[PDB]
Scaffold this motif. Structure first.
Motif, PDB file in Angstrom:
ATOM      1  N   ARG A  69     -49.324   7.096 -39.483  1.00 42.61           N
ATOM      2  CA  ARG A  69     -49.386   5.836 -40.126  1.00 42.61           C
ATOM      3  C   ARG A  69     -48.184   5.036 -39.621  1.00 42.61           C
ATOM      4  N   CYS A  70     -46.923   5.447 -39.400  1.00 37.95           N
ATOM      5  CA  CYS A  70     -45.678   4.659 -39.432  1.00 37.95           C
ATOM      6  C   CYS A  70     -44.751   5.278 -38.078  1.00 37.95           C
ATOM      7  N   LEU A  71     -45.248   6.204 -37.393  1.00 35.94           N
ATOM      8  CA  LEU A  71     -44.293   6.766 -36.278  1.00 35.94           C
ATOM      9  C   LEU A  71     -44.361   5.884 -35.318  1.00 35.94           C
ATOM     10  N   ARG A  99     -30.456   2.336 -49.997  1.00 37.35           N
ATOM     11  CA  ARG A  99     -30.187   1.125 -48.983  1.00 37.35           C
ATOM     12  C   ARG A  99     -30.964  -0.007 -49.262  1.00 37.35           C
ATOM     13  N   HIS A 100     -30.331  -1.087 -49.035  1.00 36.59           N
ATOM     14  CA  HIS A 100     -30.865  -2.498 -49.359  1.00 36.59           C
ATOM     15  C   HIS A 100     -31.534  -2.972 -47.839  1.00 36.59           C
ATOM     16  N   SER A 101     -32.592  -3.625 -48.107  1.00 38.45           N
ATOM     17  CA  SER A 101     -33.564  -4.218 -47.275  1.00 38.45           C
ATOM     18  C   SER A 101     -32.683  -4.947 -46.116  1.00 38.45           C
ATOM     19  N   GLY A 134     -28.401  -3.654 -35.487  1.00 38.63           N
ATOM     20  CA  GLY A 134     -28.829  -3.891 -34.070  1.00 38.63           C
ATOM     21  C   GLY A 134     -30.559  -4.291 -34.315  1.00 38.63           C
ATOM     22  N   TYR A 135     -30.728  -4.654 -35.500  1.00 40.93           N
ATOM     23  CA  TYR A 135     -32.412  -4.808 -35.536  1.00 40.93           C
ATOM     24  C   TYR A 135     -32.314  -6.290 -36.308  1.00 40.93           C
ATOM     25  N   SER A 136     -33.609  -7.013 -35.919  1.00 39.17           N
ATOM     26  CA  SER A 136     -33.650  -8.364 -36.209  1.00 39.17           C
ATOM     27  C   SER A 136     -34.804  -8.568 -37.333  1.00 39.17           C
ATOM     28  N   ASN A 160     -39.287   1.620 -55.923  1.00 41.57           N
ATOM     29  CA  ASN A 160     -39.208   0.467 -54.955  1.00 41.57           C
ATOM     30  C   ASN A 160     -40.268   0.573 -53.911  1.00 41.57           C
ATOM     31  N   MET A 161     -40.180   1.675 -53.053  1.00 42.77           N
ATOM     32  CA  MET A 161     -40.853   2.108 -51.811  1.00 42.77           C
ATOM     33  C   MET A 161     -41.990   2.104 -52.097  1.00 42.77           C
ATOM     34  N   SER A 162     -42.600   2.459 -53.232  1.00 40.15           N
ATOM     35  CA  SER A 162     -44.235   2.912 -53.574  1.00 40.15           C
ATOM     36  C   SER A 162     -45.024   1.686 -53.762  1.00 40.15           C
ATOM     37  N   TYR A 196     -41.865  12.795 -48.497  1.00 41.83           N
ATOM     38  CA  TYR A 196     -41.608  12.976 -47.021  1.00 41.83           C
ATOM     39  C   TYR A 196     -40.317  12.355 -46.580  1.00 41.83           C
ATOM     40  N   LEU A 197     -40.577  11.059 -46.581  1.00 40.07           N
ATOM     41  CA  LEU A 197     -39.478  10.001 -46.408  1.00 40.07           C
ATOM     42  C   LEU A 197     -38.323  10.355 -47.152  1.00 40.07           C
ATOM     43  N   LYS A 198     -38.466  10.814 -48.389  1.00 37.76           N
ATOM     44  CA  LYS A 198     -37.160  11.051 -49.212  1.00 37.76           C
ATOM     45  C   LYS A 198     -36.435  12.412 -48.723  1.00 37.76           C
TER      46      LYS A 198
HETATM   47  C1  HEM Z   1     -45.946   3.932 -42.850  1.00 34.23           C
HETATM   48  C2  HEM Z   1     -46.664   4.024 -44.288  1.00 34.23           C
HETATM   49  C3  HEM Z   1     -44.726   2.922 -42.760  1.00 34.23           C
HETATM   50  C4  HEM Z   1     -43.505   3.154 -43.423  1.00 34.23           C
HETATM   51  C5  HEM Z   1     -43.105   4.441 -44.212  1.00 34.23           C
HETATM   52  C6  HEM Z   1     -42.750   2.054 -43.148  1.00 34.23           C
HETATM   53  C7  HEM Z   1     -41.688   1.773 -43.629  1.00 34.23           C
HETATM   54  C8  HEM Z   1     -40.963   0.515 -43.668  1.00 34.23           C
HETATM   55  C9  HEM Z   1     -39.775   0.163 -44.396  1.00 34.23           C
HETATM   56  C10 HEM Z   1     -39.559   0.674 -45.689  1.00 34.23           C
HETATM   57  C11 HEM Z   1     -39.437  -1.106 -44.026  1.00 34.23           C
HETATM   58  C12 HEM Z   1     -38.219  -2.083 -44.577  1.00 34.23           C
HETATM   59  C13 HEM Z   1     -37.081  -2.014 -43.873  1.00 34.23           C
HETATM   60  C14 HEM Z   1     -35.792  -2.056 -44.092  1.00 34.23           C
HETATM   61  O1  HEM Z   1     -34.784  -1.397 -43.253  1.00 34.23           O
HETATM   62  O2  HEM Z   1     -35.145  -2.602 -45.141  1.00 34.23           O
HETATM   63  C15 HEM Z   1     -40.293  -1.349 -42.625  1.00 34.23           C
HETATM   64  C16 HEM Z   1     -40.095  -2.674 -42.014  1.00 34.23           C
HETATM   65  C17 HEM Z   1     -40.848  -2.876 -40.760  1.00 34.23           C
HETATM   66  N1  HEM Z   1     -41.849  -2.251 -40.356  1.00 34.23           N
HETATM   67 FE1  HEM Z   1     -42.739  -0.526 -41.301  1.00 34.23          FE
HETATM   68  N2  HEM Z   1     -43.405   1.000 -42.301  1.00 34.23           N
HETATM   69  C18 HEM Z   1     -44.656   1.786 -42.131  1.00 34.23           C
HETATM   70  C19 HEM Z   1     -45.539   1.163 -41.373  1.00 34.23           C
HETATM   71  C20 HEM Z   1     -45.239   0.320 -40.175  1.00 34.23           C
HETATM   72  C21 HEM Z   1     -46.040   0.076 -38.972  1.00 34.23           C
HETATM   73  C22 HEM Z   1     -47.552   0.814 -38.718  1.00 34.23           C
HETATM   74  C23 HEM Z   1     -45.536  -0.801 -38.155  1.00 34.23           C
HETATM   75  C24 HEM Z   1     -45.801  -1.304 -36.736  1.00 34.23           C
HETATM   76  C25 HEM Z   1     -47.379  -1.562 -36.322  1.00 34.23           C
HETATM   77  C26 HEM Z   1     -44.315  -1.314 -39.003  1.00 34.23           C
HETATM   78  C27 HEM Z   1     -43.303  -2.281 -38.375  1.00 34.23           C
HETATM   79  C28 HEM Z   1     -42.420  -2.693 -39.205  1.00 34.23           C
HETATM   80  C29 HEM Z   1     -41.734  -3.812 -39.027  1.00 34.23           C
HETATM   81  C30 HEM Z   1     -41.672  -4.983 -37.984  1.00 34.23           C
HETATM   82  C31 HEM Z   1     -40.415  -3.972 -40.026  1.00 34.23           C
HETATM   83  C32 HEM Z   1     -39.672  -5.050 -40.264  1.00 34.23           C
HETATM   84  C33 HEM Z   1     -39.818  -6.390 -40.776  1.00 34.23           C
HETATM   85  C34 HEM Z   1     -39.288  -7.551 -41.200  1.00 34.23           C
HETATM   86  O3  HEM Z   1     -38.103  -7.510 -40.646  1.00 34.23           O
HETATM   87  O4  HEM Z   1     -40.058  -8.555 -41.810  1.00 34.23           O
HETATM   88  N3  HEM Z   1     -44.125  -0.463 -40.204  1.00 34.23           N
HETATM   89  N4  HEM Z   1     -41.050  -0.345 -42.538  1.00 34.23           N
END
Ligand code: HEM
Length: 108
Positions: A18-20, A43-45, A50-52, A68-70, A102-104
């Motif tokens: 789902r998120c890889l 860590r704060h949002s 290096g990421y936009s 928070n994350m849930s 997992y993530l933790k």
């Molecule tokens: C899958 C369940 C999943 C997880 C876990 C996950 C985590 C996640 C977090 C916690 C962030 C916030 C980041 C921060 O550094 O503060 C985040 C952000 C984005 N994600 Fe993600 N994410 C999951 C799913 C997905 C999937 C499947 C995609 C791509 C199809 C995706 C993409 C992104 C993007 C883009 C962001 C950044 C958002 C922004 O700048 O508004 N995520 N992810």
């Protein structure tokens, strides 16, 4: 807490399926669609260099805690309207428990 640990091996898998797709977890792994997750919690949002990140994410100034994350994996767009997280969510309390256990573990 409103979070109960679960299966780390269950999480590992959800995350692949789902998120890889758009993110990496290990320290020293690269950003892809979404940012790299290493050291996320506490860590704060929107703070990986290096990421936009959407302006939405950035100003949410979310404090990343299992808790928070849930709420967040439930439906991100509701959580932070304007985020380019292309994810409808983990409707299920359990998958979510699984994953953040997992993530933790993997982002530490
Ligand atoms: C899958 C369940 C999943 C997880 C876990 C996950 C985590 C996640 C977090 C916690 C962030 C916030 C980041 C921060 O550094 O503060 C985040 C952000 C984005 N994600 Fe993600 N994410 C999951 C799913 C997905 C999937 C499947 C995609 C791509 C199809 C995706 C993409 C992104 C993007 C883009 C962001 C950044 C958002 C922004 O700048 O508004 N995520 N992810």
């Amino acid at each position: 807490t409103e979070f109960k640990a679960g299966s780390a091996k269950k999480g590992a898998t959800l995350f692949k399926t789902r998120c890889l797709q758009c993110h990496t977890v290990e320290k020293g792994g690269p950003h892809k669609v979404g940012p790299n997750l290493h050291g996320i919690f506490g860590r704060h949002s929107g703070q990986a260099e290096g990421y936009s990140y959407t302006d939405a994410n950035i100003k949410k100034n979310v404090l990343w805690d299992e808790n928070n994350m849930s709420e967040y994996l439930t439906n991100p767009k509701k959580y932070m309207p304007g985020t380019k997280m292309a994810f409808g969510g983990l409707k299920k309390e359990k998958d979510r428990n699984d994953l953040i256990t997992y993530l933790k573990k993997a982002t530490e």
